[PDB]
């Protein structure tokens, strides 16, 4: 909606910011083979209830 | 549980050395027609038994005798058997390398 409360805006803002890949130097640093962050989401198939 | 109880009464016995772990308790008749003619250990000594030897209730409690003022004697033999028991124990008591007595006193 274009008319949203600041409290809903802030919780939506955090899901946008943390929706990221693992950095590549972290993959070298921590010696990882699983490289996908499975807590990511995509707007077409998500149901963020926030 | 057997080990726990043995450990508890070892610690208690040091804390009262050289007092024994038990009070001197009286000798009473087992109660029914089925069990009379034999004796067992009672709860405490009566004031008539204590009057025999010359101790007050507060005085006898101090040197290890259990005193039960609620009990009443039923006969004259009940008194003589327990006065003799009180008289004997006062002989084998010393009041201050000393011996602590184990188990029940005068079984």
């Amino acid at each position: 909606t274009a008319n949203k409360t600041l409290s809903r805006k802030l919780r939506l803002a955090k899901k946008t910011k943390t929706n990221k890949n693992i950095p590549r130097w972290v993959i070298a640093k921590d010696h990882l083979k699983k490289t996908w962050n499975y807590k990511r989401h995509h707007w077409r198939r998500s149901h963020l209830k926030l | 549980r057997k080990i726990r109880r043995r450990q508890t009464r070892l610690q208690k016995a040091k804390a009262i050395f050289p007092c024994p772990l038990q009070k001197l308790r009286p000798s009473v008749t087992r109660c029914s027609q089925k069990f009379n003619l034999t004796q067992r250990i009672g709860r405490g000594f009566t004031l008539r038994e204590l009057q025999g030897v010359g101790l007050s209730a507060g005085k006898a409690r101090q040197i290890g005798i259990a005193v039960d003022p609620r009990r009443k004697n039923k006969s004259e033999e009940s008194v003589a058997r327990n006065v003799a028991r009180l008289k004997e124990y006062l002989s084998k008591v010393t009041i201050f390398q000393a011996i602590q007595h184990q188990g029940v006193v005068m079984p």
């Binding site: 409290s7 809903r8 919780r11 209830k49 926030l50 | -």
Partner: protein
């Protein structure tokens, strides 16, 4: 038309975010939480669901204060501090 067509009439929010438990369970029209019971002063807890009890309880969070108090008692100096005070 009680099936697929009826589902296209949904553009409402029944529940929103709770201020106490954070879940999508605060009824916007009754003003009550169906998860924790807010604005009730006590927490909603039922023994007919022990799985619901383990999901949110003591220990599933930080335990920030209770952690410090226990370690001070078990191995720190707190049992000494009571003897000075309780004298």
């Amino acid at each position: 038309s009680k099936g697929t067509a009826s589902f296209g009439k949904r553009h409402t929010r029944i529940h929103g975010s709770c201020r106490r438990c954070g879940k999508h369970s605060f009824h916007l029209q009754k003003h009550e939480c169906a998860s924790c019971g807010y604005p009730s002063a006590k927490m909603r807890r039922y023994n007919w669901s022990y799985k619901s009890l383990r999901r949110r309880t003591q220990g599933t969070g930080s335990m920030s204060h209770m952690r410090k108090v226990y370690r001070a008692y078990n191995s720190g100096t707190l049992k000494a501090n009571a003897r000075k005070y309780l004298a």
